[PDB]
Assembly symmetry: D2
Homo-oligomer: 387 residues x 4
């Protein structure tokens, strides 16, 4: 039961199942995986595709001949399995040169290098068929207040993204960008810390249509925010170009638990929203099998990501299709929420005594919302406990 | 020392010093204050002005004659003291009718009433000379996932703000709106939970120039965010129309401590930013003297808000003026952060071997940022411990 | 399905279903309930009993004749329904006199009064058959560092609890005390902020056997802690005298959502632990139907507390009984965790070359824990998705 | 000004200034330091001593001859500088063998090895003159609920600490143990997550007098707790055997900022408490110079730890010595908090009409606490802004 299919579009970063287990306090617990083995094992589990940072696929500093051979082997694995590459990204965080940032490093020479490293990988992403190019600016930020003038840093961040937009336009590429917010870690505070900040920033770019967000479940939860609500705002803005699925237990370091772990009810409401809205992008997992696990546990954890999505999809669909739930939604006036407040227009609203002088506030206030009954129907559906 | 002056533009809500001390677990500890007494006492402390919700100035449900008398008494107090009213707002949260929201209530009749209540108070705000009309949507949100379709709620929130913009335009008013984010409390999650989300929303309004943000120190800190960074993004966007100053100890219920309490170093960096950027708006305190205090403690707490701002202003100015700090800022390449990455343009960047093939990444990575020395100069200046 | 029974021992505070909906920003949305009506309605839902603060049952300041009549009516309702009163507590937080604390108020006269108020209610609790007397010191703490010397306050808190122990001993009462931790709210920081701090404090009382903890799900989660882990430590110490069940979404104000809401997987692991350990005390709900609800929603929310406990009980029992889970627990060495490290004794351990010189650390480190497979079996059982 | 002296007893872990800068997302930015160089550089800054994990001083897996040479070189550096070694600890977290724990690993063979590794290092610690042996169980815990039975794990943790106590007793050593709590990171939840939980656990050990706590500023703040309050409870219990000083910005990953950074006012109240209580132990820094820094920044950051302690010590002493503050403390009844509630005894309290029938609750409730004036005197003293 709960078998993944190609139409599910489940994807994984090479760095997810390939995470060797090094953490702030501990050495690697697993050997490095050849990307070819990850492609083949993920395909066997029913994944649709993989994603990569440049430096996951091509060791940093590789010669041109080494680069070609790494890509050739990877493409053979994709061809052997039918796996796709819908998204790629740049590693602008691991190498010590990026310790104060890539695009917003105080040192101008580093900012220029970061752009050149990204541009090289955009070309490769296009060659591999990627539709989306993610940017997670994990080093953009500060540990202290004097170190980073945020207005200047936003100027540099806009300059960088504008140059990348000029680049893809000039090459005729169809790829689009997706900015991934995170509030903190590894910097004390990261620039563009939430979906909202990233959405607002995009509106000030020269070609805003080329940029959206890549929100990650656990990152919004590191600020204690409601991930489904943030996804709704991204959808409302037309900017949900990609998504990273995982789990997180609240306000901690970025745990990258398998999807469904962490906040299970938020996972349910997320799946309900994505499916109801018709989100058509990859269901991408940015997760880490815990370092306690051997390779069998790596593949179990990856399989669990997909399984949990599919269980939640079934339960959310059953919730929305249940005539008792539909009745409860009407009892709670969800239908009215979807209707304009004043399609009659401002003057009619100003002239409407039913909106002011003749509005019976106490009668209105007496009406219960019936939200608890609705939420218990939702709980019963999630748990398969209807009756 | 540290005496407030009119040019400081310190303002207070009537509801701040007037908070009677009722909390989720406790009855009022102080009697209600007549707004006239608050105006006179705040003036004696050196405040510039006050602000109000409709229902702070005019008891809810007042007749027209009662409304006129309350306003007349208040205006006499303003005239007697020279106090100004730079900002007003609507109470769309206390009355039970607003239990599921004002502008985004599921019930359409409530949404219409909320608009009419706001419009009435915009007229009064203009009469009193207010330049800014704040909206804190404290009831917009949910405790459960099925209760509130966030895309529909954002449609209703946009409709409401668009109608208010149409209203002020039609009346020729110069007032502008400032949306106040908060992540949670009293709703389990509040819509537009951070500065970023509010900035992004504004960009989708029909007349975006009429709307900015009113960020509150403690509200961003309830999401664990960096308040100075968020203020920098608002300034970068041209949207810092007003600000609420207070203190908060991290991820808790909204404490509304006096300004300078809570995160003291964030208060220092905030003042540094506002002063360096030339912010010209009110320095408004949205705070609550703790319910442990009698009226002498109320006025001490209000005086402390202003005193702490003035101490921090002195220390931040001394930091920025110190030639040793200026040298440290250059050592940390803050000057380079402010210079364009690639004013030479995309093609020149692509052709520049110094940005890629000839970039010595290891030499760059060896350079220290010297951020710790800079931050200890900042600490020494804050504490008055230079030497 | 999932029908409560007397053996389930589900109990509710009068103040839970009776919460009128006043919050930091909003007036009451529901009328006050007569305790008699709450007793009868809860009995109809299948509850076992109720609990009370003194001032929930007897209005503060009541005359002796008024007190007698309130108690008489309440006892008739208990007799009419078969409901029990297993626990009572004192309100040492609502009245303004308690603004700096009860037992740890700086003012000595208030500390003495707080003790007398508690002692009066202990007598009543015993009369009504209560086995446990809870103390939640919600006003014990501070908003500022100079206001409360914590060593002195702990001396006063110990003195108070020691006097209460002397009192019950002197009267021959069998009741025991349960201290309820909370980290913050309504005070900026509350003394004894977690289960651990309360357990440690108890060990320093003169008669430690008379005192245990009353942990509340949401309170530990307000510190981001693992509630099942804290309950395990309380059980390990022999100190889980009572428990408060509810839901919470992380590090926020105390939400008091119905049990099962908030962190659903933590609710599952909690029920698993209580049932596996054979906890025999009340399953008490300290929750608040949201103020959006009318009385039908109050009773729906209360019914949901019990329903969710019963669903989770079924799923946890099925998890533990499943031979595949039992195999997975052995694969993950849970059996070995339960066996002594060195029952052979210190000298044998020191002499055992297999524990040091001949321990193959790399072979040991290669063994996977298989925790992800185990956790996905747990997820499948919770969701009723085995297969 | 603010020059460290030997009587200040400032100490640093080898792993602090020696941290190479590897984080969850980034490679090392600094070369490894020889412990000899750290000893000499710290001595030049005015430190009193250093501390070590076994594997900081002796590379893991070293032969006996290699071990002797590493220790000999280190002792020469201590002799050359006058530096002391007041504390040592075991690394039971870095090596992959410890991925599920040391003392509470599910695998019994690992638990035995962890004990043998610790015992070997206790012998070395004693040889170097250490008075305290710290244990930070960073791997004790879980990412999932089924992986770790917490009651069984506490049994194993008690067994381990009891064996270590038997060991030191049998050898006649004067060293004592200090357990370091942390709430999470690197495990999803860590056992003994706060000062309170550790204090409670100690009370159940066979020889409780041999064990205390080693609280760390940032670790308690990762649970949003008040670090000065927790230190007060440890002092009250007689269990503050050692302390780790650093800074943290709230509920995040463990930042290990230099002391004084993070929550500056909490640092002030901490120093006030340690000095007022006469804490006589090391002022030990467990911090990390940010990876942005070169070695000059490492030493600047270390110097800043000590400087900030000394500034805060001066300001707290001035606060306590100021006759205006002493008057304010009496106005706020801090003197009364320190006096017994009922030295007259239980019967006298029960018979005292002034404690109940004749207690004027409204007159008592009208008295203000004057806490805001007191706190603004504290702020003025911290900032050197008295006047
Ligand atoms: Mg619709
Ligand atoms: Mg500039
Ligand atoms: Mg057992
Ligand atoms: Mg004393
Ligand atoms: Mn992540
Ligand atoms: Mn991601
Ligand atoms: Mn606030
Ligand atoms: Mn505000
Ligand atoms: Mn609660
Ligand atoms: Mn409770
Ligand atoms: Mn730490
Ligand atoms: Mn430490
Ligand atoms: Na700039
Ligand atoms: Na979209
Ligand atoms: Na709509
Ligand atoms: Na602006
Ligand atoms: Na005392
Ligand atoms: Na127990
Ligand atoms: Na055991
Ligand atoms: Na002590």
């Amino acid at each position: 039961n709960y078998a993944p299919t190609p139409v599910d579009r489940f994807t994984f970063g090479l760095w997810t199942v390939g995470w060797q287990g090094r953490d702030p306090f501990g050495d690697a617990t697993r050997r490095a995986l050849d990307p070819v083995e990850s492609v083949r094992r993920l395909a066997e589990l029913g994944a649709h595709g993989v994603t990569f940072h440049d430096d996951d696929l091509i060791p940093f500093g590789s010669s041109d001949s080494e680069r070609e051979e790494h890509v050739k082997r990877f493409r053979q694995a994709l061809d052997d399995t039918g796996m796709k590459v819908p998204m790629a990204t740049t590693n602008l965080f691991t190498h010590p040169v990026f310790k104060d940032g890539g695009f917003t490093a105080n040192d101008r020479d580093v900012r220029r290098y970061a752009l050149r490293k990204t541009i090289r990988n955009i070309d490769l992403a296009v060659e591999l068929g990627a539709e989306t190019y993610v940017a997670w600016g994990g080093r953009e930020g500060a540990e202290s207040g004097g170190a980073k003038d945020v207005r200047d840093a936003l100027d540099r961040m806009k300059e960088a993204f504008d140059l990348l937009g000029e680049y893809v336009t000039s090459q005729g590429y169809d790829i689009r960008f997706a900015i991934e917010p995170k509030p903190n870690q590894p910097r004390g505070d990261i620039l563009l810390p939430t979906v909202g900040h990233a959405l607002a920033f995009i509106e000030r770019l020269e070609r805003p249509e080329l940029y959206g967000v890549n929100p990650e479940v656990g990152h919004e939860q590191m600020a204690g925010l409601n991930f489904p609500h943030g996804i709704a705002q991204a959808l409302w803005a037309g900017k949900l170009f990609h998504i990273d699925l995982n789990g997180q237990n609240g306000i901690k370091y970025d745990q990258d638990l398998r999807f469904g772990a962490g906040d299970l009810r938020a996972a349910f409401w997320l799946v309900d929203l994505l499916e109801s809205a018709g989100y058509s992008g990859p269901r991408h997992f940015d997760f880490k099998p815990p370092r306690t696990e051997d390779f069998d546990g790596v593949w179990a954890s990856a399989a669990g990501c997909m399984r949990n999505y599919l269980i939640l999809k079934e339960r959310a669909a059953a919730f929305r299709a249940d005539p008792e739930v539909q009745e409860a939604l009407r009892a709670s006036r969800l239908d009215e929420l979807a209707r304009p407040t004043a399609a009659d227009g401002l003057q009619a609203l100003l002239d409407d005594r039913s909106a002011f002088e003749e509005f019976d506030v106490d009668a209105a206030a007496a009406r219960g919302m019936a939200f608890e009954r609705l939420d218990q129907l939702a709980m019963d559906h999630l748990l398969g406990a209807r009756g």
